[PDB]
Amino acid sequence: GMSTGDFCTKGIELVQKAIDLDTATQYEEAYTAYYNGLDYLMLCLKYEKNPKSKDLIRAKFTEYLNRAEQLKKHLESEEANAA
């Protein structure tokens, strides 16, 4: 079955998908990918046994949580403006 490392990798892959969609301005789908990747990164952090990996993943978690919050606010503003 999936190792801790496998959960971490799935989170990294989902965040990379989000980053790419973000760059492409596909903000709704980027937000969803950030959300899903961040859940895997939280699981990674809880079980990670390598201290360097844990420190790096924690920094990425905070970085992309903040970006996801920015996209969520942007999407909410767009919805309000369109109404």
Residues in touch with Cl ion (CB under 5 A) = 32-33, 36
Minimal distance in Å, beta carbon 8 to Cl ion?
A: 17
Minimal distance in Å, beta carbon 18 to Cl ion?
A: 8
DSSP string, 37-69: HHHHHHHHHHH---HHHHHHHHHHHHHHHHHHH
Place of tokens 């492409």: 24
User: Of 9 and 36, which CB lies nearer to Cl ion in the complex structure?
Assistant: 36
User: Of 33 and 68, which CB lies nearer to Cl ion in the complex structure?
Assistant: 33
